[PDB]
Amino acid sequence: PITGLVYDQRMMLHHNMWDSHHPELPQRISRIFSRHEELRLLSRCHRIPARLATEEELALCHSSKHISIIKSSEHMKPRDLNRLGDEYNSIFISNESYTCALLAAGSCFNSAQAILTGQVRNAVAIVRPPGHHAEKDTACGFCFFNTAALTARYAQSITRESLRVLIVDWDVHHGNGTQHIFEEDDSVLYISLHRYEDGAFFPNSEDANYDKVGLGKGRGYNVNIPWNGGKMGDPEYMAAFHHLVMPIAREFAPELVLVSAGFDAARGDPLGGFQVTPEGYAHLTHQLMSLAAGRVLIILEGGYNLTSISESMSMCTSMLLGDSPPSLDHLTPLKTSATVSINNVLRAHAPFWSSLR
Numbered sequence: 001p002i003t004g005l006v007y008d009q010r011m012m013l014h015h016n017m018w019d020s021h022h023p024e025l026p027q028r029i030s031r032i033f034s035r036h037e038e039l040r041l042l043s044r045c046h047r048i049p050a051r052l053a054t055e056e057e058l059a060l061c062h063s064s065k066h067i068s069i070i071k072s073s074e075h076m077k078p079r080d081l082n083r084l085g086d087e088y089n090s091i092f093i094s095n096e097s098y099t100c101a102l103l104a105a106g107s108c109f110n111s112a113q114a115i116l117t118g119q120v121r122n123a124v125a126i127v128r129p130p131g132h133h134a135e136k137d138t139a140c141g142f143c144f145f146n147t148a149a150l151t152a153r154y155a156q157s158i159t160r161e162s163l164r165v166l167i168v169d170w171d172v173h174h175g176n177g178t179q180h181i182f183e184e185d186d187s188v189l190y191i192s193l194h195r196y197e198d199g200a201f202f203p204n205s206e207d208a209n210y211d212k213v214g215l216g217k218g219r220g221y222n223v224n225i226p227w228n229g230g231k232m233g234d235p236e237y238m239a240a241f242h243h244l245v246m247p248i249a250r251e252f253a254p255e256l257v258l259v260s261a262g263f264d265a266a267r268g269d270p271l272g273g274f275q276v277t278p279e280g281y282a283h284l285t286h287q288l289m290s291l292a293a294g295r296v297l298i299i300l301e302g303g304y305n306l307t308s309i310s311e312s313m314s315m316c317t318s319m320l321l322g323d324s325p326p327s328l329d330h331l332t333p334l335k336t337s338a339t340v341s342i343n344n345v346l347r348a349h350a351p352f353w354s355s356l357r
């Protein structure tokens with residue numbers, strides 16, 4: 001019955017010095033925030049302050065070497081920023097990038113704290129740079145530190161090590177970093193829906209396929225739902241939630257839900273190629289609100305059509321605030337390949353979840 005919101009325009013200062021039209025724009029977060037004002041959603045939320053993550057907090061998921069290298073970019077000359085960024089897959093770095101990544105993480109820590117202390121029921125974090133491609137030891141795909149992964153560990157650090165955290169990653173890309181950070185971990189259930197195209201879609205790794213179910217005691221706690229072929233939209237995402245995400249999540253019984261909420265599967269996204277609607281994102285949000293006593297934190301990842309992400313994320317906040325959820329068509333037939341994907345995931349995870357048996 002209270003929704004928190006965190007936004008700090010300081011996270012706009014991370015910018016691409018070599019191509020100012022790179023799609024991971026400063027204006028992503030300001031546009032999303034402005035839309036919350038236009039729709040009169042902001043005043044309905046409890047405003048949560050951003051803060052820097054500490055280096056000790058980054059160490060919850062990242063190696064000291066990786067922390068130190070990204071920190072070293074704070075005062076680099078342009079030539080060295082360009083050279084360092086080129087050492088990673090799909091990274092640009094400015095002198096503000098490290099601090100902006102710290103603010104993204106710390107904003108979500110404060111949001112998770114507000115939820116778990118009972119100050120708010122749920123929250124939204126309008127943050128950048130994104131996080132889910134960041135690995136323990138490297139930056140990747142516009143991401144420096146894995147905000148969502150860190151937030152899960154932060155949450156466990158103020159409650160208990162075994163706090164059950166569900167991370168739902170509906171960004172159109174696989175969150176390779178989140179999967180790897182938690183791959184051997186049965187306390188954090190990672191579920192990702194993502195365009196895959198048999199490895200043709202970024203991050204171009206078979207790690208994103210449906211047969212990567214986790215490792216050791218984490219077998220069953222990594223659920224990859226990869227899309228191939230068709231332009232997927234609300235029917236396919238709703239079906240994946242009905243057949244896979246929600247049955248597994250209910251059986252896991254999370255105590256906190258983090259959404260790696262990229263909006264690049266949205267209709268109109270320049271690089272996702274998918275057609276999830278703002279109503280579709282609202283439907284998925286409302287579904288997730290049935291878990292964890294409503295304790296849901298929505299964390300912006302990707303999403304690159306400024307109007308599309310602003311409308312889609314605002315509709316999620318409207319859902320968190322309790323507004324009436326949309327009625328959508330669960331009977332629209334799926335793209336053929338989507339049924340194939342769902343059946344492949346079901347077969348892979350039925351050994352681990354009785355709700356699939």
Ligand SMILES: CC(C)C[C@H](NC(=O)OCc1ccccc1)C(=O)N[C@@H](C)C(=O)NCc1ccc(C(=O)NO)cc1
Pocket residue numbers: 018019021022023090130133141142171172173201202262264270271301302303
């Ligand atoms: C119309 C364009 C916006 C297309 C887009 N191009 C693109 O990302 O530009 C990157 C760029 C690098 C250097 C200078 C300028 C720009 C793309 O999808 N390129 C393909 C090759 C790709 O996969 N690029 C890498 C990539 C990594 C992470 C995410 C994400 O959002 N993850 O959550 C998206 C894309």
Ligand SMILES: [K+]
Pocket residue numbers: 169170171172173174175192193194
């Ligand atoms: K994803």
Ligand SMILES: [K+]
Pocket residue numbers: 182183184185186188189190214218221222
């Ligand atoms: K896991």
Ligand SMILES: [Zn+2]
Pocket residue numbers: 171172173262264301302303
């Ligand atoms: Zn993405």
